Amino acid sequence: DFEEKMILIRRTARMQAGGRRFRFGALVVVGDRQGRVGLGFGKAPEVPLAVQKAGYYARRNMVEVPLQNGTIPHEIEVEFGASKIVLKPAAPGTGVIAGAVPRAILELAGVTDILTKELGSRNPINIAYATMEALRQLRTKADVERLRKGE
Amino acid sequence: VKELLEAGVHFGHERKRWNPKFARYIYAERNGIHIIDLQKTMEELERTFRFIEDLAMRGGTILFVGTKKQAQDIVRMEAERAGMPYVNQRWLGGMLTNFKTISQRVHRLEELEALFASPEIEERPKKEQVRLKHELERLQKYLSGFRLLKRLPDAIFVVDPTKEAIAVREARKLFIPVIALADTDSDPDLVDYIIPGNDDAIRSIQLILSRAVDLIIQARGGVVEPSPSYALVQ
Amino acid sequence: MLTDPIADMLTRIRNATRVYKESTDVPASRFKEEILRILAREGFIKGYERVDVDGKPYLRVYLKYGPRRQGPDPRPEQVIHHIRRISKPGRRVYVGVKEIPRVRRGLGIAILSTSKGVLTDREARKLGVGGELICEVW
RNA sequence: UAGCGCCGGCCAACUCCGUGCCAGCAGCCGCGGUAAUACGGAGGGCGCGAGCGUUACCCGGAUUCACUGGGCGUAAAGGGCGUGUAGGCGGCCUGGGGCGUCCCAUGUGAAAGACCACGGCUCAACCGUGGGGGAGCGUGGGAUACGCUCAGGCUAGACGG
RNA sequence: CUGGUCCACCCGUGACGCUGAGGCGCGAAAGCGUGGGGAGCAAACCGGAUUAGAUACCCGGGUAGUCCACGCCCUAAACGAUGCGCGCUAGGUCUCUGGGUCUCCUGGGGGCCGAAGCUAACGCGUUAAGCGCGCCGCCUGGGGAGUACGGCCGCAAGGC
Numbered sequence: 001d002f003e004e005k006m007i008l009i010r011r012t013a014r015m016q017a018g019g020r021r022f023r024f025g026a027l028v029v030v031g032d033r034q035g036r037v038g039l040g041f042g043k044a045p046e047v048p049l050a051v052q053k054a055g056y057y058a059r060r061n062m063v064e065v066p067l068q069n070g071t072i073p074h075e076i077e078v079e080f081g082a083s084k085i086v087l088k089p090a091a092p093g094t095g096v097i098a099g100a101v102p103r104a105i106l107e108l109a110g111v112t113d114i115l116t117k118e119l120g121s122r123n124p125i126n127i128a129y130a131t132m133e134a135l136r137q138l139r140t141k142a143d144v145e146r147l148r149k150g151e
Numbered sequence: 152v153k154e155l156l157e158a159g160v161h162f163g164h165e166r167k168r169w170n171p172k173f174a175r176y177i178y179a180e181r182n183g184i185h186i187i188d189l190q191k192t193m194e195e196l197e198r199t200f201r202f203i204e205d206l207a208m209r210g211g212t213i214l215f216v217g218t219k220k221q222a223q224d225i226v227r228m229e230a231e232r233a234g235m236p237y238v239n240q241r242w243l244g245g246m247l248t249n250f251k252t253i254s255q256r257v258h259r260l261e262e263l264e265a266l267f268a269s270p271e272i273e274e275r276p277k278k279e280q281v282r283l284k285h286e287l288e289r290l291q292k293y294l295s296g297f298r299l300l301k302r303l304p305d306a307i308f309v310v311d312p313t314k315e316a317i318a319v320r321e322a323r324k325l326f327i328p329v330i331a332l333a334d335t336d337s338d339p340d341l342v343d344y345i346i347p348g349n350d351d352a353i354r355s356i357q358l359i360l361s362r363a364v365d366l367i368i369q370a371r372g373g374v375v376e377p378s379p380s381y382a383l384v385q
Numbered sequence: 386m387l388t389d390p391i392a393d394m395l396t397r398i399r400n401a402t403r404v405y406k407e408s409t410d411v412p413a414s415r416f417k418e419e420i421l422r423i424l425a426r427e428g429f430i431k432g433y434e435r436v437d438v439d440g441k442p443y444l445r446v447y448l449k450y451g452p453r454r455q456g457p458d459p460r461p462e463q464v465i466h467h468i469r470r471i472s473k474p475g476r477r478v479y480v481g482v483k484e485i486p487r488v489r490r491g492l493g494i495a496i497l498s499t500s501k502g503v504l505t506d507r508e509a510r511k512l513g514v515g516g517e518l519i520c521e522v523w
Numbered sequence: 524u525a526g527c528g529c530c531g532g533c534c535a536a537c538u539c540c541g542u543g544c545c546a547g548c549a550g551c552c553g554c555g556g557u558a559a560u561a562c563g564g565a566g567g568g569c570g571c572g573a574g575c576g577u578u579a580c581c582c583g584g585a586u587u588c589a590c591u592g593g594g595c596g597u598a599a600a601g602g603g604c605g606u607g608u609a610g611g612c613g614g615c616c617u618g619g620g621g622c623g624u625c626c627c628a629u630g631u632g633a634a635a636g637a638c639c640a641c642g643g644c645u646c647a648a649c650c651g652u653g654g655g656g657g658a659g660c661g662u663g664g665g666a667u668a669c670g671c672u673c674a675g676g677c678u679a680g681a682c683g684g
Numbered sequence: 685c686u687g688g689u690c691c692a693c694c695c696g697u698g699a700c701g702c703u704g705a706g707g708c709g710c711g712a713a714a715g716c717g718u719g720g721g722g723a724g725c726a727a728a729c730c731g732g733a734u735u736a737g738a739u740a741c742c743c744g745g746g747u748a749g750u751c752c753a754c755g756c757c758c759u760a761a762a763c764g765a766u767g768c769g770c771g772c773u774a775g776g777u778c779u780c781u782g783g784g785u786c787u788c789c790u791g792g793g794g795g796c797c798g799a800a801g802c803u804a805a806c807g808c809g810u811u812a813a814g815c816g817c818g819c820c821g822c823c824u825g826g827g828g829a830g831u832a833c834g835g836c837c838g839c840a841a842g843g844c
């Protein structure tokens with residue numbers, strides 16, 4: 001129902017007497033291009049089944065994202081153990097400038113202006129997971145004063 | 152009432168197996184055993200029962216869980232006597248988490264309930280009859296109390312949190328509210344509505360479940376008198 | 386010997402928040418005060434107050450937190466997510482007003498010493514003064 | 524007048540013949556051992572166009588010398604261990620100085636150049652005019668919280684009975 | 685004869701602290717010098733046996749050495765493969781040592797399991813690999829190599 005877009009479909013494998021069989025990684029992002037977004041990573045002995053499966057998980061794990069005219073509120077750095085990612089706010093006409101992964105994220109996020117970089121590791125998977133969290137830690141001016149109130 | 156009653160033979164428990172977090176509830180440590188704060192318990196049941204209450208007046212279904220022996224039947228009785236779902240038997244991976252599939256089994260007990268009362272054993276050799284029926288027995292031996300649940304619980308009552316903590320996780324993830332009796336051997340923070348106090352002895356267990364269910368029934372309609380349990384206490 | 390009493394305090398607060406204590410104390414000191422005072426005024430802590438441990442001037446610092454969360458790990462969101470000393474003893478930092486940092490695009494604060502006093506990043510610009518960039522907090 | 528590079532992957536562009544670890548390609552991974560989208564020719568396609576490719580060197584990517592912005596149990600990395608010189612760093616209270624530091628004022632920071640605006644040559648490159656800021660240092664004035672520094676007090680550090 | 689460390693009392697000093705390039709001292713074993721000592725053990729060395737061969741594993745024998753004094757050498761899986769100092773951050777249990785009328789507590793040490801958290805994972809976790817600051821040492825693809833040249837030290841082997 002939202003939008004759909006996969007980042008990669010790798011074929012892993014495994015040993016076993018007489019040969020090797022393979023499952024199939026499949027990372028997919030999904031979003032309404034309007035704040036609601038969710039990432040998903042499915043696995044199965046079939047490419048289609050795999051993407052299909054990533055679809056189910058995608059809409060499950062979701063996250064609202066505080067969009068200021070297509071940009072992000074404040075800048076944030078979030079290290080998912082291995083890799084690390086930066087995210088910066090930018091005026092209209094800047095565009096989504098990032099590696100292929102965080103793009104899928106931010107694009108299907110409804111984001112349209114943002115400076116970013118992948119420092120550290122770069123494993124697509126981990127950078128994925130990383131960004132999700134990062135957005136999941138963005139906070140609107142309200143959230144701030146709302147917590148910083150406690151009336 | 153709810154005061155001196157619990158204040159009676161239902162307070163304090165355990166020693167040297169405790170989350171320092173649950174310690175905000177302990178009064179002292181006499182005889183080497185943790186003396187839970189009597190008053191603090193009542194204060195809690197207030198907020199709790201207010202949710203217990205509100206939750207019933209909504210008509211919402213509570214899932215009871217107590218696989219621990221010292222409460223196995225003490226759940227059975229109080230839940231049946233409340234039209235609510237319960238599990239005193241062994242819990243299962245996905246009770247709520249993998250619902251649909253666990254439910255396939257409930258349906259299977261319906262299918263088995265057909266032939267368990269139908270003129271269709273003109274067929275079915277004596278052999279098949281044996282196992283097929285034997286199934287039904289344990290089919291009920293784990294589902295009979297869960298089988299009445301058909302939607303998906305609105306909350307979960309738990310005898311001992313740490314013990315059947317697996318449930319708590321299932322529930323918690325599905326954003327299902329947690330309520331439970333819990334001694335010092337417990338993790339106070341991951342319970343949404345806490346019933347601090349003894350939970351290894353029949354005394355506190357029967358007392359809590361009693362008034363708990365009575366509250367459910369009263370918020371509903373037709374309050375009566377507690378089932379056998381005082382003799383069960385012996 | 387304790388190197389930097391300031392970094393310590395900041396740290397004491399960070400180490401305490403993570404476990405969600407109600408209040409950690411800290412060795413008292415006039416300059417240390419201001420940090421709290423501001424840190425509190427901006428809404429980062431319910432407050433503070435002088436105390437005394439076995440004949441030692443200290444400071445209770447009543448920590449703030451967010452509401453409970455629903456779902457796995459009902460971990461209450463923090464009120465102080467981030468705190469870090471900038472100018473250390475082994476590297477003093479000094480900034481002109483014409484160049485004072487904006488913490489988390491303004492969501493954040495950047496307390497700093499100055500000739501007029503300890504002031505927020507904004508209050509710095511207010512009275513138009515630069516000084517020793519102490520630390521930032523968000 | 525229309526040319527040049529490319530069309531296995533990175534990388535935008537696919538078929539056919541020839542060929543057969545040879546002829547050859549190559550920046551990395553690799554490609555050719557009779558059936559090659561990877562050699563070579565053809566048809567077609569992608570890219571740019573009075574150009575297009577190559578070689579060479581500089582900065583980038585390279586947060587791969589990390590101030591911004593990294594590390595050191597096992598991946599490269601804690602000195603064999605101690606005593607200690609130099610240097611580095613330094614707890615709580617008050618006071619004088621004001622070195623560092625912050626502020627203001629002025630001098631300087633040529634022109635050209637960079638950015639903005641507007642005008643000139645049909646446009647443009649190029650050019651004129653005007654505008655702004657600029658690190659840095661010189662003089663003067665001012666603030667004193669943190670650093671320093673002299674001075675005074677304390678006992679939580681360290682030492683001692 | 686002498687070094688360190690821990691506890692009680694809160695008596696004295698009054699920030700005298702921390703770290704530490706170079707320097708200096710210590711530094712298993714093997715090894716070197718002069719003199720001594722020599723039971724057992726034992727490189728090398730000899731014989732037996734095994735094997736295709738067996739300069740080895742096994743067996744019989746056996747010298748330096750291993751022991752002491754004095755001197756030199758200065759290397760190591762000198763290993764927790766984790767520099768030191770300080771502050772902070774749940775507990776459970778075992779044990780060594782001290783103080784206290786004590787199933788308890790309070791300190792200093794050595795172990796295991798674990799909060800939070802850190803980690804690439806294994807794992808670490810108030811004996812941190814967590815959170816912080818000071819100071820030193822070290823790293824910057826595998827090979828060539830801890831080699832070569834130079835310099836310094838050493839009787840030499842050889843070390844830096």
Ligand SMILES: [Mg+2]
Nearest residue numbers: 001002003032
């Ligand atoms: Mg739609």
Ligand SMILES: [Mg+2]
Nearest residue numbers: 001002003032
């Ligand atoms: Mg939709």
Ligand SMILES: [Mg+2]
Nearest residue numbers: 003004005006
């Ligand atoms: Mg589709």
Ligand SMILES: [Mg+2]
Nearest residue numbers: 040041042057
């Ligand atoms: Mg998963």
Ligand SMILES: [Mg+2]
Nearest residue numbers: 052053056057
């Ligand atoms: Mg499905």
Ligand SMILES: [Mg+2]
Nearest residue numbers: 064065066140
């Ligand atoms: Mg919202």
Ligand SMILES: [Mg+2]
Nearest residue numbers: 064065066067
């Ligand atoms: Mg939002």
Ligand SMILES: [Mg+2]
Nearest residue numbers: 079081082120
């Ligand atoms: Mg890392």
Ligand SMILES: [Mg+2]
Nearest residue numbers: 121122123124
């Ligand atoms: Mg790569």
Ligand SMILES: [Mg+2]
Nearest residue numbers: 121122123124
């Ligand atoms: Mg890689």
Ligand SMILES: [Mg+2]
Nearest residue numbers: 064136137138
């Ligand atoms: Mg949000």
Ligand SMILES: [Mg+2]
Nearest residue numbers: 066139140143
């Ligand atoms: Mg929000």
Ligand SMILES: [Mg+2]
Nearest residue numbers: 210211212234
């Ligand atoms: Mg119902």
Ligand SMILES: [Mg+2]
Nearest residue numbers: 269270271272
């Ligand atoms: Mg019948």
Ligand SMILES: [Mg+2]
Nearest residue numbers: 271272273274
């Ligand atoms: Mg029949």
Ligand SMILES: [Mg+2]
Nearest residue numbers: 212302303304
């Ligand atoms: Mg239900």
